[PDB]
């Protein structure tokens, strides 16, 4: 029966994502903030896709590193072909869902990866940041508050739901996210911001002394 | 079951690397020191990947020789396309992780081998040497102090953790490495150094009379 194989593959994927770290991408007044429990100082699980499009992932590293590189390549090609403002987070999320579904179906080994694509409004415009979560099977969900991925999801998600704050500043949002992730110190923490107040490139890494200052 | 097959494959790799020699890559004041158990003389278990990037491995000589040649080709092509200072140890370690994951997934027989990529600071620059360990399944780790691979890893690793001290001299580090490796002789050992005081090419083999006087 194909269905038995499908259930085995699905459970393998949820197990693989289950034994990983946790990522929280939460929308705040200045844009989107990504916080991940990343002990390594070299492997980067949060990156930039395009001028206002940011990428976060959970699961096996090389799978979502290849997915990140493919998404960056697609965004660059699309922005060159037509225009920079013609690249949106929706198209990238759709391409990610397409390729994840194709990998799940055709390929023998499913990708044990969960992806988050965040888009913020351009400079001089006002729009609610849009977060798209793409799951292993290719399912895509638009979540308008905050994405939590990898590890134990239920407790951190529930803590965030209890302590949700609309239009929170960056410092409060960072404290909220690190407290939810604990439910951790400054080290082993990778953070970034899609900053809607920057003119062209919204992505900005907050490392070292700034993380200590904000905490 | 596919789970059974994957468990057996990981165990296969564990045995294959277990019945192999041990190599130790330890950071010291002048850079990195590689010491390998090589009862051969023509075959080399330690090589140079690029100007400040060195390679060590443990497993069967065919697979990590192929991987070493591939990494050399990648580093040379990357340095020619952009610049010699645009090649980093992190890029090579990431490429090794990706290719080892692909080999594990696709090959009928996986490449049972462990790799270590060491990088030292460029000339006229101070920076903590970086060591990366890449395993049979594509997993990559960053170690700040030492790397031990192959053989009975537990006793030698614990002996290193007991006896390794940072900012060691070349003679002191070599004595520490050999003493930890006992857990052997003057010969049957392959000695190399990534030397941060060299102008361009760090890697240097220390064999024969120089090693004899050093030991």
């Amino acid at each position: 029966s194909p269905e038995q194989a499908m259930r085995e593959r699905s459970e393998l994927a949820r197990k693989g994502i289950a034994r990983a770290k946790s990522v929280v991408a939460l929308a705040y007044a200045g844009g989107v903030l990504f916080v991940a429990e990343n002990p390594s100082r070299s492997l980067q699980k949060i990156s930039e896709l395009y001028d206002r499009v940011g990428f976060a992932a959970a699961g096996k590293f090389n799978e979502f590193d290849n997915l990140r590189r493919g998404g960056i390549q697609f965004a660059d090609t699309r922005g060159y072909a037509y225009d920079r403002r013609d690249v949106t987070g929706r198209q990238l999320a759709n391409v990610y869902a397409q390729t994840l579904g194709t990998i799940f179906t055709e390929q023998a080994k499913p990708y044990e990866v969960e992806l988050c694509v965040a888009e913020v409004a351009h400079y001089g415009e006002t729009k609610r940041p849009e977060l798209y979560r793409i799951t292993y099977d290719g399912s895509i969900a638009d979540e308008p508050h905050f994405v939590v991925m990898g590890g134990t999801t239920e407790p951190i998600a529930n803590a965030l739901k209890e302590s949700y704050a609309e239009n929170a500043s960056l410092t409060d949002a960072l404290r909220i996210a690190v407290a939810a992730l604990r439910a951790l110190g400054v080290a082993s923490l990778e953070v970034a911001v899609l900053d809607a107040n920057r003119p062209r490139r919204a992505f900005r890494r907050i490392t070292g002394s700034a993380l200590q200052a904000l905490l | 079951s596919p789970e059974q097959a994957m468990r057996e494959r990981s165990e296969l790799a564990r045995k294959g690397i277990a019945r192999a020699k041990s190599v130790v890559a330890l950071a010291y004041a002048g850079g990195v020191l590689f010491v390998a158990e090589n009862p051969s003389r023509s075959l080399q278990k330690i090589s140079e990947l690029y100007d400040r990037v060195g390679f060590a491995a443990a497993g069967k000589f065919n697979e990590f020789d192929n991987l070493r040649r591939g990494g050399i080709q990648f580093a040379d092509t990357r340095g020619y396309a952009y610049d010699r200072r645009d090649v980093t140890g992190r890029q090579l370690a990431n490429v090794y992780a990706q290719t080892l994951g692909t080999i594990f997934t696709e090959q009928a027989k996986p490449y049972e081998v462990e790799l270590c990529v060491a990088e030292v600071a460029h000339y006229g620059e101070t920076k903590r040497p970086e060591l990366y360990r890449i395993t049979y399944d594509g997993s990559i780790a960053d170690e700040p102090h030492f790397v031990v691979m192959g053989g009975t890893t537990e006793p030698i690793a614990n002996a290193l953790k007991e006896s390794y001290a940072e900012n060691a001299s070349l003679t002191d580090a070599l004595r520490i490495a050999v003493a930890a490796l006992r857990a052997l002789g003057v010969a049957s050992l392959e000695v190399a150094v990534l030397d941060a005081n060299r102008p361009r090419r760090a890697f240097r083999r220390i064999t024969g009379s120089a090693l004899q006087a050093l030991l």
Binding site: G16, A20, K21, N38, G59, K60 | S139, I140
Partner: peptide, 4 residues
């Protein structure tokens, strides 16, 4: 697998 590399999950960190």
């Amino acid at each position: 697998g590399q999950y960190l």
